[model samples]
Target: LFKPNYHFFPITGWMNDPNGLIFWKGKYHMFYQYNPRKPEWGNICWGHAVSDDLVHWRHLPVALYPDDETHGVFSGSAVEKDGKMFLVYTYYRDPTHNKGEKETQCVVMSENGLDFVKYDGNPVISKPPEEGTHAFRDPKVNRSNGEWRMVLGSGKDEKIGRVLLYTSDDLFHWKYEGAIFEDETTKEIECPDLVRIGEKDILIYSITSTNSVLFSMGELKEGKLNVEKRGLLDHGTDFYAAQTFFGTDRVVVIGWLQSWLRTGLYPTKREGWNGVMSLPRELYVENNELKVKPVDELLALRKRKVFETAKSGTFLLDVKENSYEIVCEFSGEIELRMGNESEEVVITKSRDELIVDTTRSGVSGGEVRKSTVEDEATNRIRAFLDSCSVEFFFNDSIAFSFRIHPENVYNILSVKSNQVKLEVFELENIWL
Candidate 1:
């Protein structure tokens, strides 16, 4: 019953933080933290989805759910070992595990990519080293250099957070490695992950402020890691728990749409659900910064070009209440304006790279909020901004993910740019 404005069914109601994602065989598998009680968030489960490509999706079922009061399966990763999919997660303890005990890491496994049976012996890593804090959770598991290594989040009374390292020849037992990266303040790092792209390995995690952070390194040797800061995945205010799926053509990241404090008026509350997954993004690095855009396959989801404006350097598109997808391709320098004069968004693209410059309407006018993506690759942007929550798609990938407050719920958009070529798709009655 958790339907968007169009084209997707309610995968799960009241979900947050995409937990485990893996690509195996021919399909992409995604698992997320879900609350099945009601429209509000509570208790977590691993919601599942499968995709043939990465665009259109077919939701499967609730892969893992809380079965006992002692603990619930929290966030983690999925690994395919011995031709079977194994899910490694933190076994979140209830208040009774030891009355005042801390959480521990747990795991589960799936053979034919179906029902997940929790490991009879969970709480794999009970706690961190003696000096480490008890607030440890979220694990990133991977096989590297003929051995399996796991990176977890830890912060015990230190000023910053830590990504604690552990080595395990087998998934059953683990040996404490050491603190890989510690700053004294970055301790709020949640959902830690490590993946190698080319010669560099990228570390992805979420901070307490709910922003996604990334780090890159030439290589991780012996036990020491030398990583340089990259950038965030998305700058939107309401995104968290980003997880990438390996089975897709593009590096896809999923986020939890709603948090514990922000579910007062979610649209699906009336339908026995709340929250949703952000539109999956294709991840890459441009100009030494992370660039995200809606996957190219998402273009297949484009119905028919609705309203397309010809090449112009700057102009205004004052279109009425419309719901569709827009793709902007920059042949040269262009500045486009969307929304109306009273309330609007200012976007500029040069050399195919798009930047959201300003805004006066909706969630605008706060900061010169901006995001970027590749147009034609090689340090240029092709498409950016795809606003689904509020019925807008900027550039093509960067989205304005906000629901209008009680005072402002107007539908009509404006576009502007002098020498920019743009394509807008009017996707109504497509599934009807």
Candidate 2:
């Protein structure tokens, strides 16, 4: 009952951070942290899926897995060269399971796009550049300055988190440059995603402390990154470890659609599955600010019209569909509640801030999430409401991906606003 009909989720099992997101050959491939045995973390491996368009995906075999109790597969990124696609990921050796190693980088290749072969010279990066910093993982790779550049998430105890920079002429041999970025607030920054749009480069990462994904748009000089602007990549609690698939016309991102705090505490555990991916978003630089919108391909899922109006003030819409989209603009105060009276997902706007409260959303206990809005009077709101989740894009700059399970899946959508214009449509279940 808590499964998302339209969002990208596995048929069964636990899923987390997006890994090796790439567009190679003909399809967009998504590899992620997955556990096929149960709907919980552990026995981690890279679950594989591919899509012609980002909206509909077909499952592939598990890309990478733990060879034994000594090592396991972690997160990483993908790059293409010559005629084959290359994937780099962290080969994690638990400090407890086997004290031989902590985490090292490895490479694998795929020529046919279905079958993969691990490079013989595995553990491409055997050690961190600096001593005392054992925590290192999530390598994001890209082509830079005619060569290859990679950034990894790392940090040490009693110190700040760091994003280490490295460059390579060949994927096998990498030379350590320096630390490109650091965070004093968090000990370790996970999933370092480097996205370049136009001329601006954005560094996106996630920290476990706040359950928030953050971005810093800046200039990278030599091996150092100068931060000019920074903000939350996603204000909601459920979005984390966002990975960007480059080589596409637009910068598209997909995040693990579950929060760390409640990752294993979802209501769907009894149903034999958990974890999901946020709706794919195309990132762009608009008026010198990073903004994202749902990929245009998602429009294909709109199969039927539900309601449309430019009218103002409070209103109610009766739609029985579990998956849908709503585009809205409004002035002053507005509160939107979806689902039956007993259970619902509530989003409110007062002045220049948006608040998403899913405390009573369903079986899972969710908290209130907030984001600051730039537009004072008129704010834009676009929501992709699925069976067990809501992806809200606010003012083109803020993103909210929260998991909510309404028993009725939104029987009545209640909107209370001083002035508003909205349109709703029923979305098709892409998997079915």
Candidate 3:
């Protein structure tokens, strides 16, 4: 009953971290960290799914497995080269509580994009460099100026969080490079994703301690990342471990819709599943700031427009099911409530920031999230509300994602605003 109608989740099991995202052969393939036997994380394997458009997906058999040499299959990236696709991932070992296990880089190859075989010579990048701690993992590969480069999340001295760089000519052998990005305050970084837009390189990583994704826009020069600007990727409770797809014209990205604030405190575990993926977003640089918007292809799920207004004042909408979308353009201030009066989530826009309060959202942990709206796009917010998840793209500059659990379906939306128009649409179920 806590399942999402559209957002991707395992049929029944534990899932986390968008992994090995690649656009191949006219289809989009997504992989993730999966545990099949329980609604908890262990016995790591890669769950695979494919979609013609990002909106509708079909599950595939497990792509990678954990053998005796490897205890689990960890996070990584995907890239196509020389007519075949290569998956570079972490080979996890020792599923124990010692926390001193071996984590190395590994590679797998697929010819038809469905069947994958581990490289006979696994552990391509054998071990972390001396400066790196025991926490090295998550390899992201991309070609830059005719050279294939990799960036992995790591920490040093057990205190500094950083990204270690590597270079590979043939996807098999990698040469160790130094740390390209680092932060003194962050304890460790996970699931590092690097994307290039125009003249800027954006580095996105999850802070392991806080369970939040952060981004830094910079330039790659002399094998180092010089960050010019930085900010959180989402201001909501349920977004982490984001991954950007390779081989896509648009910078499409997705994240695990979860928070460690109340880790393992989900009621959905009883329903035999325990993960959600943030709706895929188009990542880009706008007005010199990093921003994301729900992929335009998602509009294909709209069934019908339920309500529309030319000028904005106050409006109440009762749409269909637990799936819907909202579009609003505004001026000074706007307020929105999803759900009824007693159990709802409220979002308010003030001059300085956008405030999201879910204190009244029922049968769930009430968490308040705030975001200082980026300066460029502050006029409108487009929201996509699924059964148990909601995502807000405010002016396409800032985004927030939350997991909601209420006694009843959140089919009623209450809005109050000053400027332009508001529209609502009933969304068709995406599961086929």
Candidate 4:
């Protein structure tokens, strides 16, 4: 199977869109959309896992399943109150009982974070905010000013997407507050999350029409989000459906690490598993922008170095380990050539932008992702290359994730730059 080293991946089926991310009772609990029987998507259920440290994981049985064959469990978030953990999710009934309400917010309670029981008054927030629209899903819950708050992603007139906020005295009943923020265009937003980092309030969401994850850094004023700066979370097509957990000291985030076109096209699907989770990243606010770095716990996966160079020109670098991690420091222009002869992922950077060319990276299904990281001088670029995926973090500000397949597993790593310093480590496989 295409088991990713040091990245959370499924064992024997398909997984996507990390859901119900939270830390409760001294352990990190992560639930995701998983199809237990196939490499393709269907029969969606909440696959559960827990980690004492975010790097090591132990998978639990399917946590929440469809009430019947027709209803599917969708993405949501989790919160802990009193002595129990509460999970809020989008209850997607096939024939949606109410008009213009194909989706609604549902709740489930867990005492031990593994076994769960759906609320008796299920579908707590029953219908879409307004009529003539059916795009309500992805509920994220938080606590603000001593009250429990929930934000759900929805669209009005089936066009303009928005995030609606709700208030509750306890965890059960909710009162609908008006839309806090709405897109200017007709893009349906999904997986909306709000987190306060430093002195800035970050509103994060994904636009379905554009397939982009974006964020707004500003202040929450008078119960509304006021925007001051806007930026992208990840500049690659493979990254989507990001969710963050406001941990004790760090805000850790994870994303589904497969493109829409490459989701079902994995060559290792014959071995049973497909899809992966990007390495958990610690997110913070810097200079009114979002910055990310790989979680510190991942350093435990570092093994012996594969290569190291100080004076970089054109080097003939060959790496036998298919899954490894690399960190490079350079300025001006640079290029990295990977994969085999016919298939490769060419990463090039200039004074203005960093481009990831995956058109020839085998499997014939990916795009050339260009991310704008404009600074006077570029500093550091770090990447984790797995057997079937690659994630790049640049300047601690921009991040990109993509899936790649090579004609041969032993990739030739070529570097072309003015001057660079590199440290490469072969990562240890965690999914055994």
Candidate 5:
């Protein structure tokens, strides 16, 4: 509703689940599940958008349609085989018994980047024989050690969402390689992604009924693999349906901006558009923790310095286009405070955590939202900030990374109680 003039666009009506994100040739191509008919999330299609440097994007027409069912093309990945881009996705069926099945693996192809053809050999990977009543979705593909591997998030006969892997000699014909990663603790986990970053391999995905995204990384040995949760990918209630891309040496992750469960806060007041994809992030494993920052192309927006200080106090550093960055360091212990006439948000060092605890905040109908990051410590923080989401990373024992979205951008930096020393840079990037 604020007249989105940046590189972001409301290409389709309601978008979710960034599907195929691959940096092929020179451009970065991102596909997602979108619904164009209405302003809400339903009747999904594959919306295509590409960028030369991952900053400004060119919105393309719908790449893949729901030819099979009204539900849509759910989620999948894209891979380049012998100079060709092949799209693999799930043909999602209705939840009710209108259709016998819920979802299964589907296929499509594109070469010159214009048109796409859904494989006549549709539903390439069907549901396993013994999987329980739970459903299947979110196919992630990657080439590992000379073989093309694809993983599907499926609730097995155990009725738990487990990542199932398949091997392919060509682009089609997948052979089941058994389940790769399974979590019996939660419900079904959707939108699964795997990437190899530096000397570590990281896996990312989100849950169905929860607004949480989790990640795990370990060494991929010859026969066995060990993965421990480094930390959460995002720590907010509105973040979900996130996907990551494995670059030549870096890992890029993205997420849908709004959520299906959060329809109350982000109401449809503006008529035309609803959902969007957050700025892509470069993900890595540093000191056994996930390190995330905005893509390099976004840094092109760093311009004139608005506020420069060695001491922290209650001050407002104006962000011209509602976007900026801040680098702050706490000498020993500090409390950075910011708020308005109504509510206040505080970032302090309690037991050990660099926490952003909000008092009362809401976008639409006035309500209160609160968040707290327990017993963690960070000496410094660099936020490659955005209007909605502030992507940040700090030295958490090593370097713990995450993001927070607080709507109030009026107050830039503030301090109270203990003294602090930090630098805040206010940037106004390219006018999209």
Candidate 6:
């Protein structure tokens, strides 16, 4: 089982696109799109899980399944209203309306946050907009200013992607307000989310055709969503369908690592599972730009220190510590070499950009991933490596996440940089 140490992946079958993430009473509830029969995408259903501290997860039974009205369950969000938990999801009726639908919003309610009962008045906002497009789904609902508000992903005339805003007095009946934002460049947007990060309103959405997630920061004034700045959420080949949840102190985000599915190369299919979630990252704004870092709870996974303040030289790391965390601060340049001589993953920093040349990493699903650092005076790179996955954070602003299938289980870490202060920690397997 080549599972990750701290990330969440189903023990079997397939998983994608985190859904219905909300913090209730005292626990965190997470729902995801899952296929239990095979390692490929099919038989879409909602898989449920709960975590107390966001680091460890306890999987539950299938939460939502297809009924006579719907063929499959798609991505959506959760909310707490009137002391009850409610899930708003897309009702996908395959074959007939594979692209978009007339009515997609569906709801279910739960008292204990585990078992749910479908609402009798489903398809609350029946039918898509009268004229433009029917590509509407993924409803992220929240209580803004004491009224229920929703943001659904949609497209305009099939050429421009947009997010539609809606308001409701109750959770069942909804009124289409207007389009929050639109872009003619993207084909379609999926898994749209809006959150308040400090004083800025952050709008997050994934461009499915491009397989990338993007964020726009602006102000939400007088019942309007505006965009002041925009940037790439993750620059890697994977990382899609990202969703954020509000923690007591911070906003944390997670995404489905999805390069293998796009490439049609199921390297991990032999292991009976094929998808993993990116590490939970706390989102914050710094210098008018969004910054993300691994949640502090991840520190509990560190078993012991493996390496420390190193001079400029190449040193081999213990192969057993393959699933570990590395934190480095340097001014000049650095290189990290992993895997064997024939096939290796090399991350070299020349100047402002950090290049992750996985041309030699074990699998061939992805290419070299690079993240640029805004501050060239000094750079701080924090990386997490697991059995078949790797996630990198550059200066807490840029991130790259992907999967690697190494033929050889052994690996090495080599560094060459001036005035380097490196610290390595061997992380324990959270699955165990």
- Number of the top candidate by lDDT? 3
The lDDT ranking, best first, is 3, 2, 4, 6, 5, 1
Over the stretch 47-160, how does candidate 4's per-residue lDDT look in tens digits? 999998888888889899987777789999998888788999998867645633268789999998777998999778887767755568999998878988888888777668
- Model 1: per-residue lDDT, tens digit, 204-285? 7777654544444445766766766556556554566777774445567766644343456345566576666666666665
- TM-score-best of 2 and 6: 2
Clashes of each: 41, 0, 1, 0, 4, 0
The estimated TM-scores of all candidates read 0.80, 0.95, 0.95, 0.94, 0.86, 0.94
Off by over 4 Å in 5: 1-9, 95-100, 220-225, 268-271, 319-321, 364-378, 384-387, 396-412, 416-431
- Candidate 5: count the clashes: 4
lDDT (tens digit, per residue) of candidate 3 on 3-107: 888889998889998899999888999999999889888889999999999879888999999985449999999999888889999988884676568899999
The clash tally of candidate 3 reads 1
Superior by TM-score: candidate 2 or candidate 5: 2
> Which has the higher lDDT value, candidate number 4 or candidate number 6?
4
Worst 10 residues of 4 by lDDT: 312-321
Clashing pairs in 4: none
Give candidates' CA RMSD values in order. Answer: 4.6, 1.8, 2.0, 2.2, 3.7, 2.2
Give the alpha carbon lDDT tens digit for every residue of 1-432 in model 2.
677778878778888888888888778999989998888888788899998888888889888879986567999999998889899999887675545457899999989877889999988999888777856898999998898989999887647888888889999999999888998999888889887888998999998788778899989886778888888878887889899995788899899888888765577878898888898888889888888778888998888877877765444565666788988888878888776768878889887678999888877767898877776568788988887888888877778888877777576666777577888888888777
Two-way lDDT contest, 2 vs 6, winner = 2
Worst 10 residues of 3 by lDDT: 311-320
TM-score of 5: 0.86
lDDT score, residue 346, model 3? 84
The residue pairs that clash in candidate 5, if any, are: 301-429, 352-376, 352-377, 353-376
